[PDB]
A paper describes a structure:
UdgX excises uracil from uracil-containing DNA to concurrently form a covalent bond with the resulting AP-DNA. Structurally, UdgX is highly similar to family-4 UDGs (F4-UDGs). However, UdgX is unique in possessing a flexible R-loop (105KRRIH109). Our earlier studies allowed us to propose a reaction mechanism of UdgX, which involves the formation of a covalent bond between H109 of UdgX with the C1′ position of the target deoxyribose sugar concurrently with the uracil excision from this site in DNA.
Substitutions of His109 in MsmUdgX with Ser, Gly, Ala, Gln, Cys and Lys showed the loss of its covalent complex formation with DNA but gained canonical UDG activities. However, H109 substitutions by Gln or Lys, showed poor activity. Both Cys and Ala mutations of H109 showed intermediate Kcat/Km values. However, to better understand the mechanism of uracil excision by the H109 mutants, we determined their structures along with a pentameric DNA, TTUTT by X-ray crystallography. The DNA backbone could not be modelled into the experimental electron density map in any of the mutant structures that were determined. Nonetheless, all structures revealed the excised uracil and the side chain substitutions at position 109. The structures also revealed invariant interactions of N91 and H178 with uracil. When we arranged the mutants in the order of increasing cavity sizes (left), we noted that the canonical UDG activity of the mutants increased with their increasing cavity sizes to begin with and then with a further increase in the cavity size, the UDG activity declined (right). It suggested that the initial increase in UDG activity (H109K to H109Q to H109G) occurred because of the efficiency with which the water molecule could be localized to make a nucleophilic attack on the C1′ position. However, a further increase in the cavity size (H109S to H109C to H109A) perhaps destabilizes the bound water, thereby decreasing the UDG activity.
Numbering used by the authors: 2 to 207
The structure:
Amino acid sequence: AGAQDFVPHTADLAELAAAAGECRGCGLYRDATQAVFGAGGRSARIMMIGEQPGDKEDLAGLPFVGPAGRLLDRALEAADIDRDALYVTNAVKHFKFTRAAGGKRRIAKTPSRTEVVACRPWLIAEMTSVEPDVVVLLGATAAKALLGNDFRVTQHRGEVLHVDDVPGDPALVATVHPSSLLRGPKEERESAFAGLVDDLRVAADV
Ligand SMILES: O=c1cc[nH]c(=O)[nH]1
Ligand code: SF4
């Protein structure tokens, strides 16, 4: 059942966000500081979904406020997407992490399929409340939550997809995770940013 028993019968994002602070749907609530719900309004045409809040998001209470958020904003700007048209969230709402002695941060640990399924009720409540025209899936974790554990983003990036089992039959565009555009050689990171901007343009045009 996961988080399903904790999700209230309401589409109000403020009430949903408050209830998510009380969620015990998986074990991630324990070590995490707080729940990081999505940001934006129900008028949004474009929903974007990442994997999970990171270290800054965990303490800031908001999604994409770190370096990946900076690179996403750089790409949204290049695709002329207004953030007024955006509801932005993640597949899990609790930071899963570890600490490496001598590190400068708490390190994100990849969510399990069990944690992603436990938390999908919140993502369904968000899609039901926002009724997006298009869902942008940022990375493998977010894309598998809605397209299956077998889905490969590398093979389907920038394709307009539609699955019948998804609420509202919104179009789905899967793309690379913005954190991937931080690591690597200059011209690959640049090629990768250009691919992200194309994927955002496809979604803005849906
Ligand atoms: O997937 C991610 C990574 C960083 N911050 C988020 O909000 N989501
Ligand atoms: S990660 Fe999702 S399911 Fe698990 S406790 Fe947090 S809100 Fe509930």
